[PDB]
UniProtKB/Swiss-Prot annotation:
Changing G139D: In HDLS1; impairs autophosphorylation upon stimulation with CSF1. Tyrosine-protein kinase that acts as a cell-surface receptor for CSF1 and IL34 and plays an essential role in the regulation of survival, proliferation and differentiation of hematopoietic precursor cells, especially mononuclear phagocytes, such as macrophages and monocytes. Promotes the release of pro-inflammatory chemokines in response to IL34 and CSF1, and thereby plays an important role in innate immunity and in inflammatory processes. It is linked to Aberrant expression of CSF1 or CSF1R can promote cancer cell proliferation, invasion and formation of metastases. Overexpression of CSF1 or CSF1R is observed in a significant percentage of breast, ovarian, prostate, and endometrial cancers. Aberrant expression of CSF1 or CSF1R may play a role in inflammatory diseases, such as rheumatoid arthritis, glomerulonephritis, atherosclerosis, and allograft rejection. Belongs to the protein kinase superfamily. Tyr protein kinase family. CSF-1/PDGF receptor subfamily. Interacts with INPPL1/SHIP2 and THOC5. Monomer. Homodimer. Interacts with CSF1 and IL34. Interaction with dimeric CSF1 or IL34 leads to receptor homodimerization. Interacts (tyrosine phosphorylated) with PLCG2 (via SH2 domain). Interacts (tyrosine phosphorylated) with PIK3R1 (via SH2 domain). Interacts (tyrosine phosphorylated) with FYN, YES1 and SRC (via SH2 domain). Interacts (tyrosine phosphorylated) with CBL, GRB2 and SLA2. Expressed in bone marrow and in differentiated blood mononuclear cells. The juxtamembrane domain functions as autoinhibitory region. Phosphorylation of tyrosine residues in this region leads to a conformation change and activation of the kinase. It is found in: Cell membrane. This is Macrophage colony-stimulating factor 1 receptor. ATP binds at L22, G23, A24, G25, A26, F27, G28, K29, V30, K50.
């Protein structure tokens, strides 16, 4: 980001055949597409393409390029949404990432729960939630090894692909956060407050451990099967005070006592005392 962009990621834009729009923000969107002759193997693949809408401004053009430059210098990991190519010459910027078959984790969890309650006219096992949690932890630990701060870790930014493997991603400009109830007004920007660490809300500081906090909130979403954090509590000055003073969500319905203990560790008031994603990973690989 704010550095030269490598041309190894360039891809012919007329070699994309676009399909349905997957997500749409205020000034950007992710669209599914079939890419032909992508990669060394010249694979023909279904992919996700990220692009700005017709309402194009200078500030929105930089935001997509920044996301691309960070992803380019990042590297490949099985449990993150990998970059496959970009279209930077010949027209509007297109960011080509892998296509995850099952969408985000939040809807998958919320649907499977509804399908599992069908006798109110496959199923999800506890092992499945431990694999989802383990997999995202591996992705975050990989970002933590590159000093790359996600700063919106949430189930809505975790995607499931072939074999229901979890990948951490970021819709960024392609989520309509303007109208999203999980993003609260805070002046110049709209922020996912209920996922944020207190020092990010007040000091506006983002680190690996601030992502560890939000990952702790993610664990609460996974093991509640898509419940909303701090449910029914309106984000206001009392909520800020409670979070800063040490208020924590109760144990979700389906988390073992030691998964809730790992949640509480991610929700420590002091950032250095929170676990690392490597420690979260290694623990969750056991479970
Ligand atoms: C979620 C997502 N994320 C990124 C992305 C990831 N990672 C970073 N950055 C790192 C450094 C964390 N950035 C900046 C990003 O933009 C790009 C596109 C994207 O969208 C997708 C991707 C796959 N599949 C779908 C989908 C939707 N529905 N279905 C059925 C499939 C949507």
């Amino acid at each position: 980001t704010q550095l030269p962009y490598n041309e190894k990621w360039e891809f012919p834009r007329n070699n994309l055949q676009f399909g349905k729009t997957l997500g749409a923000g205020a000034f950007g969107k992710v669209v599914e597409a079939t890419a032909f002759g992508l990669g060394k193997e010249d694979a023909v693949l279904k992919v996700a393409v990220k692009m700005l809408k017709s309402t194009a401004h200078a500030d929105e053009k930089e935001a997509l390029m920044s996301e691309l430059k960070i992803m380019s210098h990042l590297g490949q990991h099985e449990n993150i949404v990998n970059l496959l190519g970009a279209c930077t010459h010949g027209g509007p910027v297109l960011v080509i990432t892998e296509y995850c078959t099952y969408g985000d984790l939040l809807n998958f969890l919320r649907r499977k729960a509804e399908a599992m309650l069908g006798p109110s006219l496959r199923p999800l096992e506890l092992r499945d939630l431990l694999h989802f949690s383990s997999q995202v932890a591996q992705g975050m630990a990989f970002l933590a090894s590159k000093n790359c701060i996600h700063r919106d870790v949430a189930a809505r930014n975790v995607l499931l692909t072939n074999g229901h493997v979890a990948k951490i991603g970021d819709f960024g400009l392609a989520r309509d956060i303007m109208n999203d109830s999980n993003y609260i007004v805070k002046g110049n920007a709209r922020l996912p407050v209920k996922w944020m660490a207190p020092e990010s809300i007040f000091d506006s500081v983002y680190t690996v451990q601030s992502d560890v906090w939000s990952y702790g909130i993610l664990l609460w979403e996974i093991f509640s099967l898509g419940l909303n954090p701090y449910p029914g509590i309106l984000v206001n000055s009392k909520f800020y005070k409670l979070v800063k003073d040490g208020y924590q969500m109760a144990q979700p319905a389906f988390a073992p006592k030691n998964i809730y203990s790992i949640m509480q560790a991610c929700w420590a008031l002091e950032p250095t005392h929170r676990p690392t994603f490597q420690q979260i990973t290694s623990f969750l690989q056991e479970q």
